[PDB]
Amino acid sequence: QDNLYEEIQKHAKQYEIAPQNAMIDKIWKATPGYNGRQVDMEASYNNMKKLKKFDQKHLEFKEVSPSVHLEDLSPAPIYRGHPNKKMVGLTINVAWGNEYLPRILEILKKHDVKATFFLEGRWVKENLRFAKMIVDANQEVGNHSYTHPNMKTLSSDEIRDQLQKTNRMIEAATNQKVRWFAPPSGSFRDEVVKIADDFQMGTIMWTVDTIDWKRPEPDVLLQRVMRKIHPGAIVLMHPTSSTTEALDTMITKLKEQGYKVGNITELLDEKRVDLEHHHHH
């Protein structure tokens, strides 16, 4: 019948995925785009030719960019990654819990997984070595306001002062550009999002709250996450005993379900996840 090259061609459409555009969902608000894919004929053929057999697991792909991107959207909060992207983002809000940071960092290293550490500005000032420890562990940091106020009720001047003082503290302590801002208690209004945007920060919310600050049993926390997780989920945690005791198993179970796990920058990237197959742009 058909040679191997023709067999790959005949399966190409089956594995094609169109790119998906960024948009502001009526419920979920600002959602990134996500790359599509098409079969890379050369790499796929090279992967199969010595085996002389078509095997979909050996397909490789070229990626296709969407036309509308996250940065094209009007300012709006981000609750989630793209709902077709088989990845979960981890976020850790830091205004206390120093004693749990080293173990959390070790667990993340063990899994080669990143999390976005949203740092309160006053905490950074008072704990410069722990802020450095996070970035020294190759993790990214974000802005968590200066004093943990309810930002929805603050004046525009106070919002700006909270965000700017925190960025100046984080940038001096870590030498990292701040891309992301997490509102204290998830409390915000449009003006908060707009001022954060004026400082070139996206406003990050979540889709899965561990409620770890109530000190739940680790298995209760784990089951809560697994009941609620979905492609593109953003998980909210803090440096607590509950999170520290559950995180290793949590990441293992997320990977066993087929998810990649990473930080906000990685989650919101348009690049496709490499799970059963390898994609390249």
Explained architecture:
It is classed as unknown function. The entry lists the keywords Polysaccharide, Deacetylase, Peptidoglycan, Pseudoenzyme, Sporulation., unknown function. With about 280 residues, the chain is α/β, with parallel strands linked by helices. It has two domains: about 5-70, no CATH class; about 85-270, Alpha-Beta Barrel (TIM Barrel), CATH 3.20.20.370. The chain contains ten helices and 13 strands. It has helices at about 5-15, 40-50, 100-110, 120-125, 130-135, 155-175, 190-200, 220-230, 240-255, 265-270; strands spanning about 25, 30, 35-40, 60-65, 85-95, 115-120, 140-145, 180, 200-205, 210, 235, 260, 280. Strands 5, 6, 7, 10, 11 and 12 form a six-stranded parallel sheet that branches.
Number of strands: 13
- How many domains, as an integer? 2
Determine the fraction of residues in helical runs and give it as a percent range. 25-40%
CA-CA gap between termini: 33 Å
**Largest sheet, if any?**
6 strands, parallel
The structural class is alpha/beta
SSE succession? HEEEHEEHEHHEHEHEEHEHEHE
Radius of gyration: 21 Å
Look up the CATH topology of the largest domain: TIM Barrel
Overall 3D geometry? globular
Strand content: 15-25%
Query: In CATH, what is the class of the largest domain?
Result: Alpha Beta
Q: What is the assigned CATH homologous superfamily of the largest domain? A: Glycoside hydrolase/deacetylase
Number of helices: 10
| CATH-defined architecture of the largest domain | Alpha-Beta Barrel
